[PDB]
Structure formats: C-alpha cells, structure tokens
Amino acid sequence: APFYRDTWVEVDLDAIYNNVTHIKEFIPSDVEIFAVVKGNAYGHDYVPVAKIALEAGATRLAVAFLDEALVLRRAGITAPILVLGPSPPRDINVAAENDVALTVFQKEWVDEAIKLWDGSSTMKYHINFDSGMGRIGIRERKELKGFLKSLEGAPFLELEGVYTHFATADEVETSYFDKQYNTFLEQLSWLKEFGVDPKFVHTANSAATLRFQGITFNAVRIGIAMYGLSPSVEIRPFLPFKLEPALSLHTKVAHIKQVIKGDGISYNVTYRTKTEEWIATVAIGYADGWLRRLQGFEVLVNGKRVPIVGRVTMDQFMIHLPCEVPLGTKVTLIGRQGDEYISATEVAEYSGTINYEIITTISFRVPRIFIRNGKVVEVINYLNDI
Amino acid sequence: APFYRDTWVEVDLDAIYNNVTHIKEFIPSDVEIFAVVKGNAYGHDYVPVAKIALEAGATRLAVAFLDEALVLRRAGITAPILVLGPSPPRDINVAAENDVALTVFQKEWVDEAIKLWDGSSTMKYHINFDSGMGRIGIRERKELKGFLKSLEGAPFLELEGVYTHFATADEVETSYFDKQYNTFLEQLSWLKEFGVDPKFVHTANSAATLRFQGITFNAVRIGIAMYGLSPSVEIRPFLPFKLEPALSLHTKVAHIKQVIKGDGISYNVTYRTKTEEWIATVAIGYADGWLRRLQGFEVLVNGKRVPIVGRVTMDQFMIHLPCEVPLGTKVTLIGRQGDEYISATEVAEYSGTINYEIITTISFRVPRIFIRNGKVVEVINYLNDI
Ligand SMILES: [Cl-]
Ligand SMILES: [Cl-]
Structure with a gap:
C-alpha cells in the first residue's frame, strides 16, 4: 500500500497484544474485555487494533457511533460491537441488520424506534446508567421506570447488558468514585425491583480496571491502557505492570x-x-x-x-x-x-x-x-x- | 451516501463558486487562479471544492503532497495540479505517470531523481524561491546556479513555473513584504542571468492578491479566501469585497x-x-x-x-x-x-x-x-x- x-x-501490534494479554492476566478469568476502538482506535486505526485485541483475548469491541462499527463489520470482524455514544432512533434497522448493539436509555428513543422499525430485524441494546459522569444514561428511578414501561411496546429490542462509566477513576482520591459506585448499586437495585435481570454488567475503564477491587463485574472496557498509555500522570505510579506504548x-x-x-x-x-x-x-x-x-x-x-x-x-x-x-x-x-x-x-x-x-x-x-x-x-x- | x-x-458550494468568481473578476483577466485544496480542501473536502472552483474559472489546483493530488486524479479531475510542499525523490515517476507537477528546488533532489527515473517518464516541476518565508525553496545565488547545473543531467525534468510565498501579507504594515518582493525580484534576475525563462510566475496568496498592486504575475494561489474567510482579523477591514464563508x-x-x-x-x-x-x-x-x-x-x-x-x-x-x-x-x-x-x-x-x-x-x-x-x-x- x-x-x-x-x-x-x-x-x-506486539505492544497492543501485550497490553491486552497483561490486562486479561491481571483481571479475574471469568471477566471479559471490550477493546474500545472509538476515535479511529485512538488514532491507531479501527481494524488492525480490533483484530489484534481479539487475537490477544478481548472478546468484544466498543465504538463511539454506528459508522465506526460498520467499518469493523465491513472488515470481516464478527465479534460483538457495542456503540457507547448516543445514536439516533433512525439507526435501529441498520444496527440490527449489522449485528451491532446500541446504547439505549430514553423512552423517547424507544417511541421513535417503534415507529421506524422495519419489522425484519431484532436489535440488541445496553442500558447506560449515569451514576455521576453527567453525560448520557438514565439517572432517576422514575425515569428508569417509564423507560421500562415503554420497552414493553418494543419486543424487537433485546437487552444485552447494563453499564455505567466513572468520571474520576484517574484521580488518586476516591470520594467521587465511591459515590458513583454507590449510586450505580442503587440503580441496579431499582432494575431488580422492576423485575429486570441485568444479564451482563460492565463499569470499569482502564484506570478503574487497573486500580480497584470489586469493579470488574462481567466485563471491563479498555481504551487507553490497551494503547500502552497511563490514564493520568497521578495514577501512573500505582499501575500494577508496565504499559507498552x-x-x-x-x-x-x-x-x-x-x-x-x-x-x-x-x-x-x-x-x-x-x-x-x-x-x-x-x-x-x-x-x-x-x-x-x-x-x-x-x-x-x-x-x-x-x-x-x-x-x-x-x-x-x-x-x-x-x-x-x-x-x-x-x-x-x-x-x-x-x-x-x-x-x-x-x-x-x-x-x-x-x-x-x-x-x-x-x-x-x-x-x-x-x-x-x-x-x-x-x-x-x-x-x-x- | x-x-x-x-x-x-x-x-x-454556492459560496465557494461565488468567492472564486469574485476573485477572478477582481484580478486582471489574463491572470490564472490556482485553487488551493491542501488539507482536505481546508476541511471542506478535496474533490467537490476542486470541482466547483474549476467550474468557477480557477484553471489549476495546488496541494501539499503527492497523495492529495492522486485523490483528485482518481476523481477524474484533469486540470493541472502542483504539489506545493517538499516531496521525496522517490516520487519522480509516480508524479509523472499521474500528470502532477512537483515543487523541486534542491541539487540533491535532482541527483537522486536521476538514480530513480523510469527512463520513460517526463516530470513537470516548479521552482520555489524562498524570498523570506524560510520554509522551503532556493535562497542563494550560488545555490540556484548549482541547482540549474544539476538539472543538465535531467532532461526528463521540465520547468513549468517559478514561485515564491509571502510570510506577512496578512499584516497591515508592509515592511517585511516589501523586502520579500525585492528579494524575489533579485532572484528572478539571477534566473534570467543564468539563461532561464520563468515561463509562468506566481507569488500571491489570498491576502496578497486581495491587497497589493503589481503582485499577480501570471497567476495567484488562493486558499482561505475561496472558503470565504479573511486571512487575518487585521486586514478584514481592508478587503475589497465581502467574503462568503x-x-x-x-x-x-x-x-x-x-x-x-x-x-x-x-x-x-x-x-x-x-x-x-x-x-x-x-x-x-x-x-x-x-x-x-x-x-x-x-x-x-x-x-x-x-x-x-x-x-x-x-x-x-x-x-x-x-x-x-x-x-x-x-x-x-x-x-x-x-x-x-x-x-x-x-x-x-x-x-x-x-x-x-x-x-x-x-x-x-x-x-x-x-x-x-x-x-x-x-x-x-x-x-x-x-
Ligand atoms: Cl457515559
Ligand atoms: Cl514556501
């Protein structure tokens, strides 16, 4: 070329393979890794990073929006891919037909999806709970309740997992992170009260994964540490092994x-x-x-x-x-x-x-x-x- | 799509067509315009900007490096294209086979091009004189003489034009600009002294073209003004007509x-x-x-x-x-x-x-x-x- x-x-690519192998060795053996490739795989290129990460034992992939996921699918990749960012409802059928899961957390999105659904394709989704990042995701109990009620009109939407994201896992002090963790626990409790089994829960980014106990759940979502860089200068001294850039x-x-x-x-x-x-x-x-x-x-x-x-x-x-x-x-x-x-x-x-x-x-x-x-x-x- | x-x-595309039409009407009618598309046409996209600029009466195109020129050629664009940035000698035959002119200003580039020539291709080039931008181009009299002497060994290289570039055309006060103009004048004199017709001379960017008498030569190289923006805030008050972003x-x-x-x-x-x-x-x-x-x-x-x-x-x-x-x-x-x-x-x-x-x-x-x-x-x- x-x-x-x-x-x-x-x-x-050896470096990326080694970071992913080291992370997989460090976390519990029953915990999956999403290799997070959004942003042209942090400037490293969507496809080769995805493929190498999978070879190294990542089982799932994550990207910012649907076009990024189609880049992967057009490259022959078949592993699960979750869109982490918000997606417009008009993406329902194209996500479905391309086996891509979307983040979905609004009753209004569900309303519109019901209108736009082409009838030929079920779509997988993850719920994002906002436990303090303030970005996207469900925050309130009433809000979650009405979201679930509206999901009853959409049997073509299928829950695949539930997640939150930490705003401060790269700060030495843990007050805010601990508050997020507690808030997320309350949110999962609401979900069980409303009779929904979360199925597959993930919360941790690179910093959280490399620092904290009891944070892994069923899967972690690794970006920057896969590319061999520290999430911040202040936590560098505390990382469990050498990251390879x-x-x-x-x-x-x-x-x-x-x-x-x-x-x-x-x-x-x-x-x-x-x-x-x-x-x-x-x-x-x-x-x-x-x-x-x-x-x-x-x-x-x-x-x-x-x-x-x-x-x-x-x-x-x-x-x-x-x-x-x-x-x-x-x-x-x-x-x-x-x-x-x-x-x-x-x-x-x-x-x-x-x-x-x-x-x-x-x-x-x-x-x-x-x-x-x-x-x-x-x-x-x-x-x-x- | x-x-x-x-x-x-x-x-x-109307705004672009309009900016180019207005520039073409403002300069003398025998002066050509290069549409400058380097940098993905300043974020606007290589191909459609090139196309509409040509429809609007630009006759030539300019890019930073060879690969950008090949994007245009593959879109079926057939207008002349100059590479303004420095290029490696290994580019010689590909630029030839693709009808792309390169900026060439170094004896050592020539010696290397000699080694690397397909024995079949003829490549067009423009001489860049550095009159004070300090970036690339010939600065000295002995340098130019040595460059022209090395060209003797390269009949497959063919002069298409001669140019320079201004560092300060976007500043109100014109001292440095006046010194560049005088340096460039001396440089063209050396070129005449050494037996070379310039053929086709260009010097002005958007700011120079919009401000200055005696600066057009045979063509101007328009970037920022084609996209409908002022080269600086300082000169905005003084532009001859309204730019359409x-x-x-x-x-x-x-x-x-x-x-x-x-x-x-x-x-x-x-x-x-x-x-x-x-x-x-x-x-x-x-x-x-x-x-x-x-x-x-x-x-x-x-x-x-x-x-x-x-x-x-x-x-x-x-x-x-x-x-x-x-x-x-x-x-x-x-x-x-x-x-x-x-x-x-x-x-x-x-x-x-x-x-x-x-x-x-x-x-x-x-x-x-x-x-x-x-x-x-x-x-x-x-x-x-x-
Ligand atoms: Cl989030
Ligand atoms: Cl230059």
Missing part, C-alpha cells in the same frame, strides 16, 4: 539550510535566527493534527532534543539543529531515538491537553505502518481509499 | 436532562451546576477535531449562545441551556442561527489559534453535506470508504 510523503505513524510518529528532514543571523522563519516572522543556524523542514503540519500550539516543543533528531521554530504551517514545520544532517534524516515526534523517548503524554503536557487527544487527532492524511514480530505486516493510507 | 450520527459539516458545523441534542444543584458534569467533575440546570449532550468531541480547549465556548441553540460545560470528551460534550428543548434540536458550532453567527474565526480566537487550523482539523469522521443552489447534491462520508 503506497504513500508518497515521508511522514508516518508506526503502530507496534503502541504508537510512534515520525518524519524525515525534507530540506536543510544554513540561515544567516537575523533572518525570519515562517508566518509572521515569529522566529529569527540568532547566529548562522541550521534550519531543517519536515513535511507534517497542523492539517495532520500536529497543531500550532506545538511551536517551541522539542522533537528528536539524531537522539537530540531540538526545537520547532517559527509558526507551524498546515503541512510543514521547521526545526533548529546544532549541525548539518543529510536530507532523509529521521525526525521523531512521538517515540524513541537512542536513549531518548518522547511520550504522547509529554506532547500533551506541552500542548496543555491530555494524551488521548494527541493520539486520536493524528489526521487521516498520515499513513499508518503496522509492525508485528518486528516486521512490517500492513500499511494503511486512508487517502488512497477515497 | 449514508451516515448514522447526527453530526455533520455543511459545505455551501462556505462551511458550517452542526449537531443535534442527543440527550437532555435537568441536573440538580451541585451535581458534576464530565471527567474530573470540572463543572458543577449552580442550580437545577438543563444540560444537553451532543455527539461530537475531540476525535472530531472539536478540542478540549473549547470548554467554556458558547455554541448556538435556538438562536441563543450557550456554554459548553465540563470537559469535552472524545465523542461528546455537554451544554448548559436556559430551557428544556426537544431531543433532536439543532446545535450550531460554526454557522448561522437566526440573527446569530459563529465564524470559524471566533472559534479560533477562543481556542488561541487561527481559523485555518479550526476548519482544516475537522476530522474524517464527520460527514460533509454539499449544498448547490440550496439543494443537497452530494454527501461524502469518508468512514464509508474504509
């Missing part, structure tokens, strides 16, 4: 030159050289997700930290090197060169954000190259496929 | 609930309600390019500006509304509701960035809907092509 600019993501981001010196003292670099001349400087250019920019707020950040060239100088542009940025290098010299934005390592977390901290957002926003413009047992096994260039 | 989440980009971004209320006083919303409970509050949730988040730094930004609901509350998550965010609205209510992130308008510029200013970066980073996840003469003519859902 070809690509024609020397800028690429490298995804180490799966993603790196590289570029090659596309031009190099010596720029006289005082000359300007990039838009609005926000950087001037202070001596005769070696300035390299690389072919990646904010259209690839490498945003302007990274100006001044230090990338790796020949194992040395070297700064991005001048404004980052849509497709290119410049770097001040101490020495001439040849055109083609590898430049690493996330990953390892020699003894040096730039984590997605370090890029995120410089950017004033979190690692999730750094990885997931690496744009579809950038090819992914997949490594397994140390050999390249696949290249995906999403531009090729338009 | 189907999509299964109610979040979308609207691209008004082509892109808006919308979603729907996917959940709505009343949350009691003091309850928390989203990760790390960074927002708690100050009274009993109506909180809506929408299915777009940072994986769509709607980044966490937009927390606190006000979007439009029912013609009213309302705040994003709590952390934006990968696929969803929450909004504090003054009144209950029905599920499915329209939420506009960029665009018009009633008398209210949120420009990409306003989003950028809140974000501490520029409008270019806001539009161009709307993810491949989000479907684009295209409007011509007020009717939908096309939907592109990139996730489908996977």
Whole structure:
C-alpha cells in the first residue's frame, strides 16, 4: 500500500497484544474485555487494533457511533460491537441488520424506534446508567421506570447488558468514585425491583480496571491502557505492570539550510535566527493534527532534543539543529531515538491537553505502518481509499 | 451516501463558486487562479471544492503532497495540479505517470531523481524561491546556479513555473513584504542571468492578491479566501469585497436532562451546576477535531449562545441551556442561527489559534453535506470508504 510523503505513524501490534494479554492476566478469568476502538482506535486505526485485541483475548469491541462499527463489520470482524455514544432512533434497522448493539436509555428513543422499525430485524441494546459522569444514561428511578414501561411496546429490542462509566477513576482520591459506585448499586437495585435481570454488567475503564477491587463485574472496557498509555500522570505510579506504548510518529528532514543571523522563519516572522543556524523542514503540519500550539516543543533528531521554530504551517514545520544532517534524516515526534523517548503524554503536557487527544487527532492524511514480530505486516493510507 | 450520527459539516458550494468568481473578476483577466485544496480542501473536502472552483474559472489546483493530488486524479479531475510542499525523490515517476507537477528546488533532489527515473517518464516541476518565508525553496545565488547545473543531467525534468510565498501579507504594515518582493525580484534576475525563462510566475496568496498592486504575475494561489474567510482579523477591514464563508458545523441534542444543584458534569467533575440546570449532550468531541480547549465556548441553540460545560470528551460534550428543548434540536458550532453567527474565526480566537487550523482539523469522521443552489447534491462520508 503506497504513500508518497515521508511522514508516518508506526503502530507496534506486539505492544497492543501485550497490553491486552497483561490486562486479561491481571483481571479475574471469568471477566471479559471490550477493546474500545472509538476515535479511529485512538488514532491507531479501527481494524488492525480490533483484530489484534481479539487475537490477544478481548472478546468484544466498543465504538463511539454506528459508522465506526460498520467499518469493523465491513472488515470481516464478527465479534460483538457495542456503540457507547448516543445514536439516533433512525439507526435501529441498520444496527440490527449489522449485528451491532446500541446504547439505549430514553423512552423517547424507544417511541421513535417503534415507529421506524422495519419489522425484519431484532436489535440488541445496553442500558447506560449515569451514576455521576453527567453525560448520557438514565439517572432517576422514575425515569428508569417509564423507560421500562415503554420497552414493553418494543419486543424487537433485546437487552444485552447494563453499564455505567466513572468520571474520576484517574484521580488518586476516591470520594467521587465511591459515590458513583454507590449510586450505580442503587440503580441496579431499582432494575431488580422492576423485575429486570441485568444479564451482563460492565463499569470499569482502564484506570478503574487497573486500580480497584470489586469493579470488574462481567466485563471491563479498555481504551487507553490497551494503547500502552497511563490514564493520568497521578495514577501512573500505582499501575500494577508496565504499559507498552503502541504508537510512534515520525518524519524525515525534507530540506536543510544554513540561515544567516537575523533572518525570519515562517508566518509572521515569529522566529529569527540568532547566529548562522541550521534550519531543517519536515513535511507534517497542523492539517495532520500536529497543531500550532506545538511551536517551541522539542522533537528528536539524531537522539537530540531540538526545537520547532517559527509558526507551524498546515503541512510543514521547521526545526533548529546544532549541525548539518543529510536530507532523509529521521525526525521523531512521538517515540524513541537512542536513549531518548518522547511520550504522547509529554506532547500533551506541552500542548496543555491530555494524551488521548494527541493520539486520536493524528489526521487521516498520515499513513499508518503496522509492525508485528518486528516486521512490517500492513500499511494503511486512508487517502488512497477515497 | 449514508451516515448514522447526527453530526455533520455543511459545505455551501454556492459560496465557494461565488468567492472564486469574485476573485477572478477582481484580478486582471489574463491572470490564472490556482485553487488551493491542501488539507482536505481546508476541511471542506478535496474533490467537490476542486470541482466547483474549476467550474468557477480557477484553471489549476495546488496541494501539499503527492497523495492529495492522486485523490483528485482518481476523481477524474484533469486540470493541472502542483504539489506545493517538499516531496521525496522517490516520487519522480509516480508524479509523472499521474500528470502532477512537483515543487523541486534542491541539487540533491535532482541527483537522486536521476538514480530513480523510469527512463520513460517526463516530470513537470516548479521552482520555489524562498524570498523570506524560510520554509522551503532556493535562497542563494550560488545555490540556484548549482541547482540549474544539476538539472543538465535531467532532461526528463521540465520547468513549468517559478514561485515564491509571502510570510506577512496578512499584516497591515508592509515592511517585511516589501523586502520579500525585492528579494524575489533579485532572484528572478539571477534566473534570467543564468539563461532561464520563468515561463509562468506566481507569488500571491489570498491576502496578497486581495491587497497589493503589481503582485499577480501570471497567476495567484488562493486558499482561505475561496472558503470565504479573511486571512487575518487585521486586514478584514481592508478587503475589497465581502467574503462568503462556505462551511458550517452542526449537531443535534442527543440527550437532555435537568441536573440538580451541585451535581458534576464530565471527567474530573470540572463543572458543577449552580442550580437545577438543563444540560444537553451532543455527539461530537475531540476525535472530531472539536478540542478540549473549547470548554467554556458558547455554541448556538435556538438562536441563543450557550456554554459548553465540563470537559469535552472524545465523542461528546455537554451544554448548559436556559430551557428544556426537544431531543433532536439543532446545535450550531460554526454557522448561522437566526440573527446569530459563529465564524470559524471566533472559534479560533477562543481556542488561541487561527481559523485555518479550526476548519482544516475537522476530522474524517464527520460527514460533509454539499449544498448547490440550496439543494443537497452530494454527501461524502469518508468512514464509508474504509
Ligand atoms: Cl457515559
Ligand atoms: Cl514556501
């Protein structure tokens, strides 16, 4: 699969397999893993991550919205897939015909689904209880009650599981998390009172799964830890085993030159050289997700930290090197060169954000190259496929 | 073309056609326009923008790197296409077989292209002179001479044009711009001295074209103004005619609930309600390019500006509304509701960035809907092509 600019993501499928294996070893043997692939598998690519995670013993998959799930099904994947985000009622039949379960938690959604149902297809759903995330899900007892009442008109909807999600499992202090846990217990009690067997319960994300007792239920939902990154800096010290980061981001010196003292670099001349400087250019920019707020950040060239100088542009940025290098010299934005390592977390901290957002926003413009047992096994260039 | 989440980009093809028509009428009638589509046509989608710009009288297209050019060629577009960014020598024969011109400005690129030539292909190229952008291009007299000498060994490489790019055309005060113009003049003189006809010269981006006499040459390269946005706030007062913004971004209320006083919303409970509050949730988040730094930004609901509350998550965010609205209510992130308008510029200013970066980073996840003469003519859902 070809690509024609020397800028690429490298995804180490061994690393993803090892994180999933380690998690599966760490949790009880009767507890399933959803591999959570939403956001183009956190920027690692939907399909290869899904397949490797399954190979490593994840049994189920989860994605943000229905189109993401169809990407998986069109790739030949047959494992269960749950849509975690809210879905409009018009998705009922297409979810059904593609064996995809949806999160459903509103009597109004059920009303509309009854109207839109094509009569040929039953759909599986999970109930989301909002136990303090404030995002989606049922919160109140009366609310749950009317939701169940309306479900009686929809025998084509079939409960497959019930879940909640934690807002603070990545904070050392547990007050809010403990309140969520207690609230969720009350919600499950309501459900049993209304005569509904939850069947299959899941609550824990990466942070909760790696920290807390009695949190596993029937399944956990793993995103960031599968990609080998800590949910936060503050809990890193407390994780039970070493996470192996799966993603790196590289570029090659596309031009190099010596720029006289005082000359300007990039838009609005926000950087001037202070001596005769070696300035390299690389072919990646904010259209690839490498945003302007990274100006001044230090990338790796020949194992040395070297700064991005001048404004980052849509497709290119410049770097001040101490020495001439040849055109083609590898430049690493996330990953390892020699003894040096730039984590997605370090890029995120410089950017004033979190690692999730750094990885997931690496744009579809950038090819992914997949490594397994140390050999390249696949290249995906999403531009090729338009 | 189907999509299964109610979040979308609207691209008004009329606005684009109109901006290009107006630019074409504003510049001299023998001056061509490159339609600049790099970055997924600044978030608007490569192919339909290219097509409508050409229908509108643009005669040529420009992209950042080869793969973007091949998207256009595969869509059956036959107009000239220039790659503006730096390309590896290994690109030589593919760019030839695909009728794509590359930017070429390095002796070493030539030496390498010599090695790599199909012995059959002829490739067209433009010389980039760096007159002060500091990014790529020839800067020196001896450099140019050496470059032209190496070309002697490459009869398969054919000059199509010569260009430079301005770093400061979007600043009121013109000192740096005037120095670039003078440097570029000297550079063209060296080129004439060394026996080369430029053939076809271009220098101006949107801001230069809209401001300056004597700057058109044989063609201008239009990006941001084609999409109907000002290159900066500083020069907006001074543009010769009104720009018509082509892109808006919308979603729907996917959940709505009343949350009691003091309850928390989203990760790390960074927002708690100050009274009993109506909180809506929408299915777009940072994986769509709607980044966490937009927390606190006000979007439009029912013609009213309302705040994003709590952390934006990968696929969803929450909004504090003054009144209950029905599920499915329209939420506009960029665009018009009633008398209210949120420009990409306003989003950028809140974000501490520029409008270019806001539009161009709307993810491949989000479907684009295209409007011509007020009717939908096309939907592109990139996730489908996977
Ligand atoms: Cl949730
Ligand atoms: Cl340039």
